[PDB]
Design a binder for this molecule. Structure first.
Ligand SMILES: O=P(O)(O)OC[C@H]1O[C@@H](O)[C@H](O)[C@@H](O)[C@H]1O
Length: 294
């Protein structure tokens, strides 16, 4: 009856289009939410027979520690995807492009300038910046990579961590910044846009030193009784019309070549974002980088 999806995404991004899939395909979709690595660890310890069917969200092509929990599968539409971001992981289909961002409370900021990671180290901001657990979250892990990528110095990562408060959940960062508990935080584009569009005093900052771009992925979960419509769901989520819907409604950044680019107001087009070049990312395993910065 039920197709189960693991997703670190928030409900407001995926519940509507997953509802549209229910309406079109007459299948009931339930979502298991959580931090990326928490979902992957819970999935790993799940019986084959209780497991869900699809994992969507997170930098799956680079942070799946147990490939034996997934089925080798990429959607056929990878041929229509942007050349620079096609998954090199046979278990993962690229789904969305998600810039990681700095979020600033524009009511608390005042005259303080925050242009990137270096500005977060200003003494006035000490202990008043937040980020999420790099061991459990995609956002915290990708931000620590971005800081390390600046000069490939672990001391830069430690300097930031000694300056900021680590939170358990990524979405707690944007909530506490938007509500005025912190001056700034390390978040991602869609989560920042959710609260800014709700009227909260939130500024979205793309770090001038280099903005990490997440290639979010979709993967089929190895279970005993896979729902036979799960490949239709992956095709649905990576299709042109559905990707166009995500772009039009959320200012999402599509993985496809044949979908519009939309950067309403303070959301920036990828061409105007100082992305960290691939050549600056050292190609270091997920677990090893976490050992490096511990
Ligand atoms: O709670 P998490 O693990 O940070 O995940 C929440 C989100 O983080 C972003 O960085 C990713 O681009 C999203 O795909 C999603 O994973």
């Amino acid at each position: 009856n039920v197709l189960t999806v693991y997703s670190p995404y928030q409900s407001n991004l995926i519940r509507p289009i997953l509802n549209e899939f229910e309406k079109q395909e007459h299948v009931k979709i339930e979502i298991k939410h959580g931090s990326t690595q928490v979902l992957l660890s819970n999935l790993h310890n799940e019986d084959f027979s209780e497991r869900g069917d699809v994992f969507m969200g997170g930098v799956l092509s680079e942070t799946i520690d147990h490939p034996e929990d997934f089925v080798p599968y990429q959607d056929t539409s990878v041929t229509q995807q942007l050349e620079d971001y096609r998954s090199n992981n046979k278990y993962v289909t690229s789904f969305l492009l998600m810039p990681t961002v700095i979020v600033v409370n524009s009511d608390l900021q005042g005259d303080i300038k925050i242009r990137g990671y270096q500005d977060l180290l200003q003494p006035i901001l000490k202990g008043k910046i937040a980020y999420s657990n790099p061991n459990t979250t995609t956002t915290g892990y990708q931000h620590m990579r971005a800081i390390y990528s600046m000069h490939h110095r672990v001391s830069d990562v430690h300097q930031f961590q000694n300056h900021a408060m680590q939170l358990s959940k990524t979405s707690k960062v944007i909530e506490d910044v938007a509500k005025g508990k912190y001056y700034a935080g390390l978040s991602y584009e869609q989560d920042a846009r959710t609260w800014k569009n709700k009227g909260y005093p939130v500024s979205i900052v793309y770090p001038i030193e280099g903005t990490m771009l997440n290639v979010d992925g979709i993967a089929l979960v190895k279970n005993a009784h896979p729902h036979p419509k799960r490949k239709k769901l992956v095709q649905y989520l990576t299709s042109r019309s559905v990707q166009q819907r995500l772009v039009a409604e959320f200012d999402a950044k599509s993985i496809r070549k044949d979908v519009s680019e939309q950067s309403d107001q303070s959301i920036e087009n990828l061409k105007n974002i100082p992305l960290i070049p691939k050549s600056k990312l050292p190609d270091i395993p997920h677990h090893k980088f976490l050992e490096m910065i511990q």
